[model samples]
Target: DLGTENLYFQSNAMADFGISAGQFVAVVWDKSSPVEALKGLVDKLQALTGNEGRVSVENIKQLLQSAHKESSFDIILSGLVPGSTTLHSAEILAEIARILRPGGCLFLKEPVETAVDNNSKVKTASKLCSALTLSGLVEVKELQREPLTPEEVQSVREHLGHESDNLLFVQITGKKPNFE
Candidate 1:
């Protein structure tokens, strides 16, 4: 599995599931704090999994090109960061498609705009899903929504001091066509 640095939460979750370092790769933006965090996480995961792993911080374009040449990854996971606009997400998703091998999958979890805010351009989960579908990958499932439990809500409030109306979490999975 491969993922961006902002996806540290997912990376930790993967490690918890017994994913060895040899089975995981983390990619981070060239200039982000997550790069350092990813390095620390890699070391921690290596100790826990007993497998040497690699974490890279580079330009997304360069990373995609490298993946195309290496052609080894089978799954890519990406999550929306706070304030990620729809247009930016679309571009990143397209890059993911370009690097993925035929039959490879991209799993995404992102925020979506809600109906309550008519003119608000907050992240919309469907927009990203539709964009990925339009990019030619087949959607394996409809968007699934998961709301935060009450405990989670309180935790968020305590940590961030702000309560969201409700965060929309959508999981959209798609596969690249296998022509062979």
Candidate 2:
């Protein structure tokens, strides 16, 4: 379901996640992803980064399996992840490693649980962090979860019912090692 989520209101982390400093930012997603819905956000991103963003249309399998050229972006955001397992992520993670500039960052959000053979299984934070580390990125860490700003919280609740104080979102930010 390549739907557009109006995440702007909920995405406080992006503004403070150090992307504004990146010279180049890459937005990669599946074919049917809601690219237009994100235009406004990326427009802001472009302004902050002071560079034209790069856009690519590719599914998780393509990203994971393609032998993409190396070190092409200062930052990479993999907006698409194949659900269920981190399955076959080595190749895409490898592509990410190959193309990300040293000192660049990769941002992503993965679910806490993945459906496995009709049974739900936990997708631990460590497991994905290890996957990223094995791909050669360093300083991999799960950013502490925080709530949407007050206005955002208020707006969401007025229309979407009472959300909780708990941070249900999982956003892990990682950086490529500057040395090596």
Candidate 3:
């Protein structure tokens, strides 16, 4: 997905997932970025796309390294780091720390093994919050942790060394303190 800028602009982004300025900016994955699909969204949401500007950092490690400004972002949204092996909370936070403004919020949805998709990579709610705390985030809270559905139980069981009958899903919210 890393090529040159502007050349990739049109197709590289999709929806105003509420990350643009006050509305949204997208880190469009190749598959999620379809030309026709994004065209309509762009047409309807262009004003929300890049009112400030956009920069490309080679990887998440370099997240704000290429940025023209610091603490320029008000919200740092995440969906990619929590479950994936390639990404970790530390790197995400270090870079996020550089770019996010004070009092900003980081919203991450993750899987907390509770029910036997045994190979699932997940974290306990406490463990995840501690990670955020260590990463300079404060006021961590779980915005949602709906109970395990019968559909999810079978998929999460015997996973993460946990017994087969515990709460299976969790979502947490944490804020980067004004000072740290």
Candidate 4:
């Protein structure tokens, strides 16, 4: 589920790529925020895809709790910005471990600090990643450092209006234990 704003693009892109009914769950905070525009876009997606869509505008904990009670998911993608505080990455990863099905994947895409600048952010990301592994996630892929795509770079420039040497993008995938 999407936990923050600016996920409309990802949501729409997923739908366009043929994600089926009940396959996508989007979670965000504060439905009244400007990001609520995503709801309309998602609605259009539901109509087009003929698939069920769910949106939860609550704290991430509550969302995960509710999801756990309802159905088990095969994969969960946790997308977070470096500075957002509604929920920390470690907590999110723990919750994912609690609810994810065996062999399920939790994919985390976040900003890591590369240079001396924003070192706190980088440290936080690293600690969170470590915590996820400790929490029983098997690392499937690890990218210690990677350049942002041109689209991502352009989006950052448009939003921040400056080159960011401190920002690093990391793709870390973890899998739950598979039991036979």
The top-ranked prediction according to lDDT is 2
Worst 10 residues of 2 by lDDT: 79-88
Error of 3 at 93 (Å): 2.6
lDDT per model, in order?
A: 0.50, 0.55, 0.47, 0.50
What digit string (tens of lDDT, one per residue) describes model 2 on residues 47-164?
6676455543345666756555567677776642211112226567767877787887887654432222223232445676788889888888886443444543453354334444
lDDT of 1 by residue, 1-180 (tens): 123333446556454323454543333233222344445544544454444543333354465565543334455545422222112245666667666667666655554545444444445665666788766578556446766546435544454344468555566778777644
How many angstroms is residue 90 displaced in model 3 relative to the true structure, after the best TM-score fit?
2.2
- Candidate 2 residue spans exceeding 4 A from truth: 1-13, 51-59, 64-68, 80-88, 114-122, 144-168
Q: Report the C-alpha lDDT of model 4 over 49-144, residue by residue, as the tens digit.
A: 354544233345465565563225555544433222222355566677766667666655655555544424343356557877876788656644
Predict model 4's lDDT versus the native: 0.50
Ranking by lDDT: 2, 4, 1, 3
Pairwise lDDT winner, candidates 1 and 4: 4
Kindly list the per-residue Cα lDDT of model 3 for residues 105-142, writing each as its tens digit. 66555556443333434656777777778878788887
